[PDB]
Amino acid sequence: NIKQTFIKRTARELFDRYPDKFTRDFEHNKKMVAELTNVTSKTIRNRIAGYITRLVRMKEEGK
C-alpha cells in the first residue's frame, strides 16, 4: 500500500513552500492541508498533517 516515504516527501515540500500557515495543532493542520493541497484521500491528507505537526514541533524546539 501507500508508503511513508511518499508522505514525508510531500509533507516536506508543502512545509517548505508555506512555513507560515501550519501550526502545532493537528486539526488546523488537517484543514490547511485539505485547502492548500489537491490530494484525494483522507488517509494521505491526515498522514501529511501528522508529519507536518512533527516538523513544526522540531523546528520550534531543538537539541
Binding site: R12, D16, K59
Partner: protein
C-alpha cells in the same frame, strides 16, 4: 521566482537543494545570506577560508583563483561548486541564481520559503559559526 530565507540553515545542504532546483529549471533568490551557519571549530573554519583567499597564480594575479570575502559571494560560490560549471547547461543554471545580504526593499513585503532538510535544529553539537563572522574575519564588507 522562489525566494528562500537563509536564517538558520546549514550551508551545504541549502546549496545542494538549490543546485538541484536550478538544474531542474527554476529561478531562485536567496535573502539573508549572512545568517546561514557553518558547523565545526572556529579556528579550523577560519584557517580554511583564509588559505582559500591566499591562493593565487604566481606569474599573473590578474588571472588566478578569486575566492570570495563576502557572505553572498561565499554562498554563491558554494552553489557553483555544486554544479557542472564547464558547460552551457550549468552556466545557464548558475545565471538563474541571485543572492542578497539582508532583505532589500524590493522584496520587502513577501512570505519566504524555507528548507526542512536544512535547518539548525537537526543538530545536537553546539559548535557552529556564522558566515557573517567568517566574512568579518576575512575583512569583507558585510
Amino acid at each position: 521566482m522562489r525566494i528562500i530565507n537563509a536564517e538558520g540553515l546549514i550551508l551545504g545542504r541549502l546549496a545542494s537543494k538549490v543546485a538541484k532546483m536550478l538544474l531542474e529549471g527554476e529561478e531562485v533568490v536567496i535573502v539573508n545570506a549572512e545568517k546561514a551557519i557553518i558547523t565545526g571549530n572556529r579556528e579550523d573554519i577560519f584557517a580554511k577560508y583564509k588559505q582559500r583567499t591566499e591562493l593565487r597564480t604566481r606569474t599573473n594575479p590578474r588571472r588566478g583563483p578569486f575566492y570570495p570575502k563576502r557572505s553572498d559571494e561565499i554562498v554563491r560560490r558554494t552553489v557553483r561548486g555544486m554544479l557542472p560549471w564547464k558547460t552551457d547547461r550549468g552556466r545557464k543554471a548558475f545565471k538563474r541564481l541571485k543572492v542578497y545580504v539582508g532583505v532589500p526593499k524590493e522584496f520587502e513585503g513577501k512570505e519566504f520559503e524555507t528548507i526542512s532538510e536544512a535547518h539548525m535544529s537537526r543538530l545536537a553539537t553546539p559548535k557552529y559559526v556564522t558566515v557573517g563572522e567568517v566574512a568579518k574575519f576575512l575583512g569583507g564588507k558585510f
